[PDB]
Amino acid sequence: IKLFSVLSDQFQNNPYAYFSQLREEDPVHYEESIDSYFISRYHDVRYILQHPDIFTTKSLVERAAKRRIVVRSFIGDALDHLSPLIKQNAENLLAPYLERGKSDLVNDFGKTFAVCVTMDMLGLDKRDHEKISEWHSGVADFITSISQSPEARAHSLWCSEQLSQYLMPVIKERRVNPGSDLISILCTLSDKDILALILNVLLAATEPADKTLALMIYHLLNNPEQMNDVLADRSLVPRAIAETLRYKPPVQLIPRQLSQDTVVGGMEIKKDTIVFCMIGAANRDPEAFEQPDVFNIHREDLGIKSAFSGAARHLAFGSGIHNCVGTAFAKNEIEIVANIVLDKMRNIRLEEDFCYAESGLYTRGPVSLLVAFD
Ligand code: HEM
Ligand SMILES: c1ccc(-n2ccnc2)cc1
Ligand SMILES: [Mg+2]
Fold first, then answer.
1. Nearest CA-CA partner of 106 in 73, 10, 97
2. Ligand nearest to the CA of 316
3. 204 ligand 1 Cβ < 6 A
């Protein structure tokens, strides 16, 4: 019986083995330790994201009316000016790995890459990608964890202290002479509010991007004919990005607190309680997608022309008026790296005896990705 916990070691070894069980027999799955309900079905999940008056949310600031419009119109104008930067970042970061013909896309290249991109977005110095990459974890670990050793929380708090002490001077600096980056622009609306937006944009643009790339490569390689497809026609890359997003969404839950007494699915839920949209479940629901547990970049129901917008078929960006602002931007970013990886690592295989693993419950990705090449 689904009394089973979606927070168990058992579940984290493989979320996809239990989604059917859930959306079919306990589609509004209640949790014991947290006082929250886990929503399994597609059309429920979609309705939740579509209605934020009833289902409020908060921003990823936590322990240290809409402005997204200007943020989105930054990312739309900026997207052009960042393309050679995103391009250089990839080329540069791969440079040390080409001689050996061997690499770990998650741990040698991925995280570092995602960081430098966000840094260009915020116009920071890429000499500091390490400090920033490390601090970024600490805060993120805080958000993503169910519990923390007093050490880890002591450590996350530090990362946070450290980050704002780094960014805040830069805000004053640009407040008085802007440039063509986000921080400069957000200053043209309080000092500390700008710190919050930046921070949010730092956590949001960073965690998922590295993750998806690895995922896409992995599943491309695991279906080598589909790989060869993308090798011979590169306009395929988006469908390939998109189908990875549905298959194995990097962000796995999207919270919503409840503004009222309300019902969706079987049980009647009460005021001020928070729910978790299970995105994996939704994108593996037979009711939205045909042969849902099959990776196919060529699926007729992906809806590619809509895959990266406010009203897409898959939901790894969320859905509606409150979806990931950097969808346009993410698209291009992953598009660019993918092509660069594909170009530089001629004949990519998976490493002999490479056994594959995913870790994450709130955000999920490969632990590592051992590819070999020419
Ligand atoms: C790898 C691709 C990406 C995925 C899968 C992804 C996913 C998501 C999801 C699930 C949300 C929550 C949506 C909701 O509230 O329903 C979100 C929000 C957001 N995304 Fe992304 N995202 C991606 C890339 C990016 C990029 C490149 C940016 C660059 C600006 C970005 C900026 C944001 C921001 C600012 C939020 C607002 C959340 C908040 O702080 O209130 N995302 N994204
Ligand atoms: C930690 C937890 C969630 C996220 N996140 C939120 C929206 N897109 C990614 C980023 C870092
Ligand atoms: Mg089909």
1. 97
2. 1
3. yes
Using most ligand atoms within 8 A of CB, pick from 57, 145, 251, 325 the residue to mutate for ligand 2: 251
What's the fold here for domain 1-374? Cytochrome p450 (1.10.630)
Domain ranges of the chain: 1-374
Contacts of the segment 315-319: beta carbons below 8 A, 24+ positions apart: 315/42, 315/45, 315/46, 315/49, 315/249, 315/277, 315/279, 315/282, 315/283, 316/245, 316/246, 316/249, 316/250, 316/251, 316/279, 316/283, 317/245, 318/49, 318/254, 319/46, 319/49, 319/50
- Cβ of 251 closer than 6 Å to ligand 2, yes or no, is yes
- Residue located via tokens 């009394």: 3
Which DSSP symbol is given to 126?
Answer: G
Determine whether the annotation assigns residue 324 to a binding site. yes
Give residues with Cβ within 8 angstroms of 84, minimum separation 6: none
Q: How far is the CA of 82 from the centre of ligand 1 (A)?
A: 18
State the structure-solving technique.
X-ray
Name residue, tokens 């805060």.
139
Query: Around 159, how many Cα atoms within 13 Å sit in the side-chain half-sphere?
Result: 23
Pocket mutation for ligand 1, best pick of 317, 323, 337 (most atoms within 8 Å of C-beta): 317
| Structure's resolution in angstroms | 3.1
Query: Which two structure tokens, joined as six digits, stand for 75?
Result: 């990312």
C-beta of residue 347 within 8 angstroms of C-beta of residue 249: no
Amino acid at residue number 305: K
Ligand 1 centroid to Cα of residue 83, in Å, is 19
Alpha-helix residue ranges (DSSP H) falling in the chain: 9-12, 19-25, 42-49, 68-81, 83-94, 111-122, 129-144, 150-176, 182-186, 191-222, 224-232, 237-247, 279-283, 327-344
Give the distance (Å) from ligand 2 centre to CA of residue 181: 22
Known binder of ligand: residue 299?
Answer: no
